[PDB]
A paper describes a structure:
The UvrA2 dimer finds lesions in DNA and initiates nucleotide excision repair. UvrA2 is also an ATPase from the ATP-binding cassette (ABC) family of proteins, which have a distinctive composite nucleotide-binding site for coupling ATP binding and hydrolysis to conformational changes. UvrA2 is an unusual member of this family in that it has two ATPase sites per monomer instead of one, resulting in a total of four sites on the dimer. The two sites on each monomer are termed ‘proximal’ and ‘distal’, and each site comprises an ATP-binding domain with Walker A and B motifs and a signature domain with the ABC signature motif.
UvrA2 structures from different organisms have been determined in nucleotide-free, P2ADP-D2ADP or Pempty-D2ADP state, with most in open conformation (including the T. maritima UvrA2 structure reported here) with a shallow and wide DNA binding surface, and one structure (in complex with UvrB) in closed conformation with a deep and narrow DNA binding surface. UvrA2 structures determined in open form are in either nucleotide-free, fully ADP-bound or, in one case, in Pempty-D2ADP state, suggesting that ATP hydrolysis by one or both ATPase sites favors this conformation (the fully ADP-bound structure reported here further supports this hypothesis). Nucleotide-bound/free UvrA2 structures reveal signature domain II in different conformations, suggesting it could affect ATPase-driven changes in UvrA2 interactions with DNA and UvrB. Such dynamism has not been reported for distal site signature domain I. A C-terminal zinc-binding hairpin within the proximal site signature domain II also adopts different conformations and is implicated in ATPase-modulated interactions of UvrA2 with damaged DNA (the UvrA2 structure reported here shows the hairpin in a new, intermediate position). To gain additional insights into the finding that nucleotides are held more tightly by the distal ATPase sites than proximal sites, we interrogated atomic models of several UvrA2 orthologs for underlying sources of the differential affinity. Detailed examination of the complete set of contacts between UvrA2 and nucleotide at all the sites revealed 21 polar and 28 hydrophobic contacts per site, on average (both proximal and distal sites make 21 polar contacts, and 29 and 27 hydrophobic contacts, respectively). These contacts are highly conserved between the two types of sites and between orthologs, with one notable exception. The proximal site has a glutamine residue that precedes the ABC signature motif by five residues (Q821, G. stearothermophilus residue numbering). In contrast, the distal ATPase site of every UvrA2 ortholog features an arginine in the equivalent position, which is involved in a pi–cation interaction with the aromatic base of adenine (R480). While both residues stack on the adenine base, the more extensive interaction and pi–cation stacking by R480 implicate this residue in the higher affinity of distal sites for nucleotides.
Author numbering: 2 to 60, 69 to 117, 400 to 916
Amino acid sequence: NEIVVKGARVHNLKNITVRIPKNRLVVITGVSGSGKSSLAMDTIYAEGQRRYLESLSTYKKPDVDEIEGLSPAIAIDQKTVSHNPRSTVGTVTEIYDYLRVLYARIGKKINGLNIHEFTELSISEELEFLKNLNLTEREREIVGELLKEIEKRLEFLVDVGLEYLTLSRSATTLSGGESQRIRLATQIGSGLTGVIYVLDEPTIGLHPRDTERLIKTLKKLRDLGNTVIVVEHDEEVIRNADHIIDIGPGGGTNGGRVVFQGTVDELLKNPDSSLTGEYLSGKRKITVNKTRRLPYASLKIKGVRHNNLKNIDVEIPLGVFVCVTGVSGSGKSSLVMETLYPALMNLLHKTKLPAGEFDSIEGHENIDKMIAIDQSPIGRTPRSNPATYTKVFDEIRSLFAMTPAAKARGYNKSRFSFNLKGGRCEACQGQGYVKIEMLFLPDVYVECDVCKGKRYNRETLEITYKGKNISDILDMTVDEALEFFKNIPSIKRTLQVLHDVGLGYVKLGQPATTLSGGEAQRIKLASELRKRDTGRTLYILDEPTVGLHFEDVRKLVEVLHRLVDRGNTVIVIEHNLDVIKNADHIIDLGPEGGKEGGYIVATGTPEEIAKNPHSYTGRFLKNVL
Ligand SMILES: Nc1ncnc2c1ncn2[C@@H]1O[C@H](COP(=O)(O)OP(=O)(O)O)[C@@H](O)[C@H]1O
Ligand SMILES: Nc1ncnc2c1ncn2[C@@H]1O[C@H](COP(=O)(O)OP(=O)(O)O)[C@@H](O)[C@H]1O
Ligand SMILES: [Zn+2]
């Protein structure tokens, strides 16, 4: 049987009708902004969940005509995460309750450890502890099958690359990738069948060493009797699909269409319609830089012992492209984000950030500035958008104020701000939607019926520049606007860097709160790229390929080489081999995650790492060099 999506029009989807096989591993592919999430999350998941919830007591619809063959749907992404600070790995996985029943059926301690002490072992240690239990002959008969269930659920955590976590770990201290995979392990452990699962890039944060095991886990989720829809860019996940849906042909206005549908073999046989197929067949490639850079100096952080780091000294060559690599849990974010970054902020720029344990830093005088480019949002209210954040909107407002019609009406540039009274729609605060005054719980946000969502009063909307009013400009994608304003240098420059980091599909007025973490990071990256005379700035970026198709990664790599070419240093934490194979220098941590990680397993060029038999990263690098 099949899901039949009829007349899908959410965002840039071109009123498409798509048939999707059920009880299959379906991989949705395509460049950023092509419409993968619009189809899989905003249409299929949303409607499947909505139709189930409408069966409840006492009880929104996406822009779509109908969906045949729908089932209740469950999403696994970075938004389906716990916000309860009380929650731990043990509680969000539902393993803690099983442990409670186990301890109530045996005693306060089991083989020397109480329950809290059990939860403080890593997952692999917990598994070995339980499997080395045969303390009794009849307690077996009261907990036996129960232990099996506990073991089953722990094994699923190992299977999604999280063996280094403890059950006692606070859920809010997990990364987005860790949270996604925790939820995957919990959903497969639940054994629920008959649902449509929609997963957003479940390889985020996962080393290639673990990809195959993740793929087996996705197939087990399928084999329970579920449809498993995965939005993914990873080549191996794509090659393991039962069915591929490739969205394109491009992003933004140039996207919203299914350009290929069928098996992997069919995609390889006829790839010239899809970028995805061209990369998969080798017709298109992210190039390996064949001139590795040498550093002009280095800095060195000594005695790092934060978390599992094994009292390591780490040298950062400056003026080159640096990747920090290694399996998940090996210590990369502990080293880079939680020790080196705050320690250099404190030395160079206004201290007082807490930093992981370490002895000293030498050579920090060899850089002038330390800037993190992370995935935290660019703003917290829809009053922020890409145009205001990069501050090109101030230039667009001046331009509108300079039209003959605006000057004759007395409209200065403030008239064209939706954050100031005057030109903005005062009913909807200059946002386009109003709430219902209940008393406080998440109310409905209905579209403003005065302005119809356009954010400005009708008088302000009468001013046009080349037939477009200010609302029209906010509805342009970056690429549209980049063509529209190509004769205005200050505007074109900002729009150009947004296009160069791969955000040509993003609308100028998209509210900050709807942007993914990767999109926020790339906007901030474009802001840094736009600046002149940065010189000896060290930039740190954590996993900047989240959300990125092959072509998007090609763009990201070009941008990073541009930053380094103008004298900067770049450190990225990555698992992506197309980025790593472009590094001038790699610091590979591990060998494993947790207690058996935290060592420096290898350093040097991609070629040197590839030659190192102790490096998992080098083992996969070998095949792309
Ligand atoms: N919440 C939103 N509001 C308005 N436009 C959006 C929103 N989310 C995505 N878009 C736009 O819709 C188009 C498709 O986006 P999306 O479905 O997220 O692409 P993908 O998942 O393929 O990266 C893009 O031009 C994007 O900028
Ligand atoms: N609150 C915490 N935040 C981050 N890591 C933690 C925390 N508590 C313990 N750790 C551990 O530190 C070790 C290294 O983790 P991390 O630096 O996150 O690895 P990576 O970034 O390579 O995936 C892991 O064993 C991880 O479980
Ligand atoms: Zn309004």
